[PDB]
Amino acid sequence: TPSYLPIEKIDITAHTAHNIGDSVWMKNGTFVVASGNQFYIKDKSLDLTDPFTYQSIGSRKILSNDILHLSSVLNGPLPVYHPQFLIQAIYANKLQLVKELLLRLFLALRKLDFESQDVSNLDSNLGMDPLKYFIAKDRDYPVESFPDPYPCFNKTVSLALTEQLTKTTLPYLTRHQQITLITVIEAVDEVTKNENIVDYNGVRFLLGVKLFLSHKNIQKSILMRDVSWALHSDNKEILLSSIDRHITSWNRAREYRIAYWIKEQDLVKKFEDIAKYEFSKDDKRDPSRCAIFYLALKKKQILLSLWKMAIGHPEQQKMVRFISNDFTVPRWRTAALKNAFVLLSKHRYMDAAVFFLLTDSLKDCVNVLCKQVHDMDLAIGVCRVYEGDNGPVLGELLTAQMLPETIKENDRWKASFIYWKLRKQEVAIKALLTAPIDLENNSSIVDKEVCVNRSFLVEDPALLYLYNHLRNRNLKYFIGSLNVEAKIECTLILRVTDILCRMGCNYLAVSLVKNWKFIE
Amino acid sequence: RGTITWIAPAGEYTLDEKILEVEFDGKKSDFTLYHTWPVRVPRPVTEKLSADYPLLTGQRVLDALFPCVQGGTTCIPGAFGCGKTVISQSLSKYSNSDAIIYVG
Amino acid sequence: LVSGEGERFTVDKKIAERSLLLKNYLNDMHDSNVPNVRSSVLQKVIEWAEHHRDSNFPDEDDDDSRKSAPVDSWDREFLKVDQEMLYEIILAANYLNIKPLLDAGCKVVAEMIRGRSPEEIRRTFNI
Numbered sequence: 001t002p003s004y005l006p007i008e009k010i011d012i013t014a015h016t017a018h019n020i021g022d023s024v025w026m027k028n029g030t031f032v033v034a035s036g037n038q039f040y041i042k043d044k045s046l047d048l049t050d051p052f053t054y055q056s057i058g059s060r061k062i063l064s065n066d067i068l069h070l071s072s073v074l075n076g077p078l079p080v081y082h083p084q085f086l087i088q089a090i091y092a093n094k095l096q097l098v099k100e101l102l103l104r105l106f107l108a109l110r111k112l113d114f115e116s117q118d119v120s121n122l123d124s125n126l127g128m129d130p131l132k133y134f135i136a137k138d139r140d141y142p143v144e145s146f147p148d149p150y151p152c153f154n155k156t157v158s159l160a161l162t163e164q165l166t167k168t169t170l171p172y173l174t175r176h177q178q179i180t181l182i183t184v185i186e187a188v189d190e191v192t193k194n195e196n197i198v199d200y201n202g203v204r205f206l207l208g209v210k211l212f213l214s215h216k217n218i219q220k221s222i223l224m225r226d227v228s229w230a231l232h233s234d235n236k237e238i239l240l241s242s243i244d245r246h247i248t249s250w251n252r253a254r255e256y257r258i259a260y261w262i263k264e265q266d267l268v269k270k271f272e273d274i275a276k277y278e279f280s281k282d283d284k285r286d287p288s289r290c291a292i293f294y295l296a297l298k299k300k301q302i303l304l305s306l307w308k309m310a311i312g313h314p315e316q317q318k319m320v321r322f323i324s325n326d327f328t329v330p331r332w333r334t335a336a337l338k339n340a341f342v343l344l345s346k347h348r349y350m351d352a353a354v355f356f357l358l359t360d361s362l363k364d365c366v367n368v369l370c371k372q373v374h375d376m377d378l379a380i381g382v383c384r385v386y387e388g389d390n391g392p393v394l395g396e397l398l399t400a401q402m403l404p405e406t407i408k409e410n411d412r413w414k415a416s417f418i419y420w421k422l423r424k425q426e427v428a429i430k431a432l433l434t435a436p437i438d439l440e441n442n443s444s445i446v447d448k449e450v451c452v453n454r455s456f457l458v459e460d461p462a463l464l465y466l467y468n469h470l471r472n473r474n475l476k477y478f479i480g481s482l483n484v485e486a487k488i489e490c491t492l493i494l495r496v497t498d499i500l501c502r503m504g505c506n507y508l509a510v511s512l513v514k515n516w517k518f519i520e
Numbered sequence: 521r522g523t524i525t526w527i528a529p530a531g532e533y534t535l536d537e538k539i540l541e542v543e544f545d546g547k548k549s550d551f552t553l554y555h556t557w558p559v560r561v562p563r564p565v566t567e568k569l570s571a572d573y574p575l576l577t578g579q580r581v582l583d584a585l586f587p588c589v590q591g592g593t594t595c596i597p598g599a600f601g602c603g604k605t606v607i608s609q610s611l612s613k614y615s616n617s618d619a620i621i622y623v624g
Numbered sequence: 625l626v627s628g629e630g631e632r633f634t635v636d637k638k639i640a641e642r643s644l645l646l647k648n649y650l651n652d653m654h655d656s657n658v659p660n661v662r663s664s665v666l667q668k669v670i671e672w673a674e675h676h677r678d679s680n681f682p683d684e685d686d687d688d689s690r691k692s693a694p695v696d697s698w699d700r701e702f703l704k705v706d707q708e709m710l711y712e713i714i715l716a717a718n719y720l721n722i723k724p725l726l727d728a729g730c731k732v733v734a735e736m737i738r739g740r741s742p743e744e745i746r747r748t749f750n751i
């Protein structure tokens with residue numbers, strides 16, 4: 001969205017051809033305009049026929065029709081039920097608080113309906129005590145109870161809320177924001193079920209994917225934020241089993257970026273299943289598609305059998321006669337390399353990667369997968385299943401193909417992931433705070449002026465919440481240097497606030513500054 | 521085939537100066553600005569397409585009545601003074617072709 | 625003992641002992657043996673410490689206290705001088721481990737944000 005949005009076009013020209021003489025705001029938004037000896041004082045109300053006012057107000061509902069009130073709706077603290085506040089209170093370790101706010105929202109809506117009062121009377125803070133937002137830790141939250149008919153947030157309250165939110169239009173919320181609020185209710189319902197199993201980097205990932213499902217129109221794969229939430233979770237098995245139902249095809253194992261974070265011991269099984277599916281696609285049986293998954297696993301024999309049973313395919317006779325050889329033989333190794341480089345010139349990139357993997361030249365299979373096929377997701381998967389979980393070919397691939405673009409794009413999620421897969425944990429944790437161009441002589445990769453800068457560098461509060469997690473688990477790497485680390489923690493805390501404040505979550509900014517623990 | 525071990529920078533090079541080094545199976549090969557090809561072996565292509573664009577000569581009869589396409593094969597039988605060579609040269613002059621190989 | 629960006633102050637005093645960080649990092653127990661804080665906010669914090677030099681607080685041992693109570697009016701007016709600087713004043717009070725200023729800043733900023741909601745704006749600003 002633009003940082004500024006027009007809300008009125010005071011068109012004095014519609015009455016006189018004389019140019020505006022002078023313009024001056026005054027008390028309560030009164031905008032006095034002068035021309036000749038003749039003033040055009042406009043009050044702070046709004047004319048809904050204007051295209052600017054109509055577009056800025058959008059679908060919202062506002063108590064007063066004012067430029068002052070409108071400018072206090074498009075900006076300023078969020079109502080505590082706003083979806084952008086609830087997801088940000090979930091990313092911060094305040095899930096219990098979000099559950100309580102949803103319960104209070106239900107109670108307030110029932111109160112309004114029972115008294116037949118208009119919903120616009122709904123309290124923005126839902127009668128919450130502000131100190132609740134400042135509680136340092138999720139398990140220290142005083143989760144009080146309510147009267148018997150609905151004592152604590154649960155499935156019944158969830159369904160009642162999802163009904164009410166369709167039977168009423170919450171104030172200040174564009175209908176799309178209300179849809180995302182309903183999806184947040186569903187996500188909290190899911191988390192409450194899994195809340196007893198997955199640590200809280202599992203809860204953040206679960207909400208990330210549940211929000212992804214509602215935005216497949218504009219979002220083509222879970223952000224690297226969610227991949228990094230899951231990558232550092234201790235319960236990757238639970239997350240994978242929760243999103244498994246959606247991973248039927250490779251195109252859906254590439255949306256959830258499973259190759260990045262799922263455990264190698266599950267990535268092997270997922271390649272087996274994805275090979276099964278990719279073979280028996282909608283069209284017909286074709287061992288060409290599932291070749292890479294079966295070779296990466298080192299199951300050339302299954303691929304050979306697959307080619308054999310594919311009697312109808314035109315390529316069958318050549319491939320059965322070729323693949324059956326033993327590619328430890330130098331002559332056949334060179335023959336397979338030659339065929340791989342021929343297929344790279346006949347524009348058959350996937351087959352070139354397959355052949356480059358027959359001979360165990362992984363460094364050439366993964367470079368054909370990430371550079372000519374454009375699947376870094378599949379390259380990482382093949383690296384992780386074929387050779388091992390972390391490096392050595394994966395390290396070179398990431399440092400060559402991903403690190404430069406990450407530095408140019410100034411992306412710190414990718415940089416942290418890369419320095420994690422290189423098992424450079426001590427600097428992988430630091431890459432979350434300091435920009436990639438300043439890490440490990442990365443300035444040698446690209447000139448500092450080529451990198452993105454200016455307003456495009458919008459912070460990401462979650463990026464800090466991850467650090468405070470890793471920083472606390474990997475203290476061994478931070479005891480050696482405290483003053484230098486604090487010098488940048490105290491900068492990124494004040495730069496993460498001032499976006500938590502610019503995105504309306506002031507209550508979370510105060511919590512972040514209040515509760516941050518400096519490692520003395 | 522192979523992995524570019526070295527690629528020359530922009531500048532003026534004679535045909536004999538090395539321009540590229542490429543390693544395949546640990547063996548390094550050197551490539552200049554030219555290469556030799558057996559004239560009796562056809563040069564490979566990824567796939568053979570279907571010729572669908574006209575070979576617009578300058579001749580009304582050949583363009584309208586008996587058109588040829590880019591990538592087609594045509595023959596011009598005739599006696600010893602009916603213009604097989606004048607047609608050939610007019611085509612070499614005014615055809616759409618980006619390059620002409622005139623074989624006598 | 626003072627911020628490097630042109631920041632200076634009384635090297636030590638009964639006030640500087642108010643900061644529980646300086647209770648150990650201010651050469652406390654010298655017989656047995658600031659960088660982060662911004663200059664202006666450092667001045668503000670020492671002003672608050674000097675003002676309360678003649679007061680006492682229950683510290684973390686307040687149990688039910690240390691919260692759920694109105695803030696001192698002078699502290700209210702003193703901190704309510706800048707919305708953007710109040711967060712970094714809270715962060716400074718956090719780094720120095722000074723509980724009373726932290727509590728006061730959190731109360732003040734919580735009330736600011738609560739009073740910025742549209743309902744409170746209409747109920748207290750124009751009505």
Ligand SMILES: Nc1ncnc2c1ncn2[C@@H]1O[C@H](COP(=O)(O)OP(=O)(O)O)[C@@H](O)[C@H]1O
Nearest residue numbers: 597598599600601602603604605606607608610
């Ligand atoms: N399109 C033409 N316009 C004018 N004269 C032509 C044309 N085509 C052929 N001729 C004449 O015919 C002569 C003999 O034809 P030539 O081009 O040698 O073909 P061929 O090799 O079949 O004999 C040419 O030298 C020229 O004088």
Ligand SMILES: [Mg+2]
Nearest residue numbers: 600603604605
């Ligand atoms: Mg002739």
